């Protein structure tokens, strides 16, 4: 299962996904079979440049006509760490004299290391890649997404940074609140549990 890779001399953009599907009017059709090994992909409009990578995949006539996908990504110096940080920001769909857009939310990391994700789509129960309303008619999913763009040294993937993390913001909030309540409870429990009763009665 080979990945798709741009060939500006030594390869520069590498993208891979274990599964990939797109649907127009709520009609699922698998597209991984037609890519990731099909050398006839129209990988023409794609463009590379130091601190910029426009990846474009134009598809031959299906779903009605030829349809183009466009995944943008760029890195930038950050003074706060003295590093180079990258993100892929916009998904653009091009169709019959028409265009559709999508933000990107969490796909980011150091430019030295590749990025990985398990589910990236615009469908509930996974959660990602949504723009301000305009519901449109476009479903777009990749399973086992992985990418690298800016400092590849060959036909290989570097260390993979994963979007999972040992914690999430809501978890941290709940944990801190529960910790405060627990500290207060154990203080009260200590005070009540030290109570003792008398031994003998008067007279």
């Amino acid at each position: 299962h080979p990945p798709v890779s741009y060939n500006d001399t030594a390869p520069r953009i590498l993208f891979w996904a274990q599964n990939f599907s797109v649907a127009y009017k709520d009609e699922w059709k698998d597209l991984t079979s037609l890519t990731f090994g099909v050398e006839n992909l129209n990988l023409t409009g794609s463009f590379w440049n130091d601190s910029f990578a426009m990846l474009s995949l134009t598809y031959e006539p299906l779903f009605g006509a030829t349809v183009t996908f466009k995944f943008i990504l760029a890195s930038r110096f950050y003074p706060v760490s003295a590093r180079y940080w990258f993100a892929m920001e916009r998904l653009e769909i091009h169709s019959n004299g028409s265009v559709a857009h999508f933000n990107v939310s969490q796909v980011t990391g150091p430019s030295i290391y590749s990025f990985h994700c398990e589910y990236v789509s615009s469908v509930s129960k996974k959660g990602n890649l949504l723009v301000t309303n305009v519901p449109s008619v476009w479903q777009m999913t990749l399973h086992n997404f992985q990418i690298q763009a800016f400092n590849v040294t060959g036909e290989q993937f570097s260390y993979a940074s994963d979007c999972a993390g040992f914690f999430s913001p809501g978890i941290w909030m709940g944990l801190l609140t529960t910790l405060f309540m627990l500290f207060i409870f154990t203080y009260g429990l200590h005070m009540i549990l030290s109570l003792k009763t008398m031994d003998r009665f008067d007279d």
Partner: protein, 150 residues
């Protein structure tokens, strides 16, 4: 829109309003009972005389109940984080003020019963200090109301 975690915090606040405050009251009552024992054998006529601390513990419980009911009626599915944390703050503050007041009343009630067991004139004095305990609970409750608006 809002996250799904949001409903958590607010509900937890209600639980505090019926845990911590209640626990304080419990301690108070227990301690007072011990005092009555030490006073029952020698000065038997003043058993009912010492009904005053135990009720003054139960009032703390009452306060908790009030706020709990309120935070059981302002809870709705579509709550923003702002409201959730307001309610959590109210619940925490009222529960802890109840707890501290409960500890104070318990100790003061032991000392009061023991003191009156040997000196009738001390009676009024103990009552005075007991008031300064109970009022502390009210202070907690105050901010609860201030946190049902802002």
């Amino acid at each position: 829109n809002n996250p799904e975690y949001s409903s958590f915090f607010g509900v937890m606040g209600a639980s505090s309003a019926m845990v911590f405050s209640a626990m304080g009251a419990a301690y108070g009552t227990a301690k007072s009972g011990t005092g009555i024992a030490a006073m029952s054998v020698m000065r038997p006529e003043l058993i009912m005389k010492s009904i005053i601390p135990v009720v003054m513990a139960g009032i703390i419980a009452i306060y908790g109940l009030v706020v709990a009911v309120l935070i059981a009626n302002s809870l709705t599915d579509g709550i923003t984080l702002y409201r959730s944390f307001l309610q959590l703050g109210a619940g925490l503050s009222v529960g802890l003020s109840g707890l501290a007041a409960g500890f104070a009343i318990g100790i003061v009630g032991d000392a009061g019963v023991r003191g009156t067991a040997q000196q009738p004139r001390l009676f009024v004095g103990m009552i005075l200090i007991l008031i300064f305990a109970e009022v502390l609970g009210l202070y907690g409750l105050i901010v609860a109301l201030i946190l049902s608006t802002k």
